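ok so heres the complex, two chains, lmk if somethin looks off
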Amino acid sequence: MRGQIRGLEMASKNSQDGISLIQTAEGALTETRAILQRVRELVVQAGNTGT
Amino acid sequence: MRGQIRGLEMASKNSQDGISLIQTAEGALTETRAILQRVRELVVQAGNTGT
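and the predicted structre for the whole thing:
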């Protein structure tokens, strides 16, 4: 029992840690998304400025 | 959604820009029209001054 208990709490810590890893990656991708938004704006503007 | 929103406002800016291009060309053609008016006057006057 004890084996699985302390192992289980450790596993939950491990899970939260995985979440925070995801938080970092998610923030990087958030910013990437902002960049790509700006890019698309420049593409549209480029589209009219073909003239 | 956001993609199409900011892209849409940018597209509207692009449209206004196209309008102002048309304003320039239209002014040039306005003046051209004044010239051609003067020309026609000179043609008519030339017509009687064939005599």
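quick notes: The radius of gyration of chain B is 22 Å. thats all i got rn
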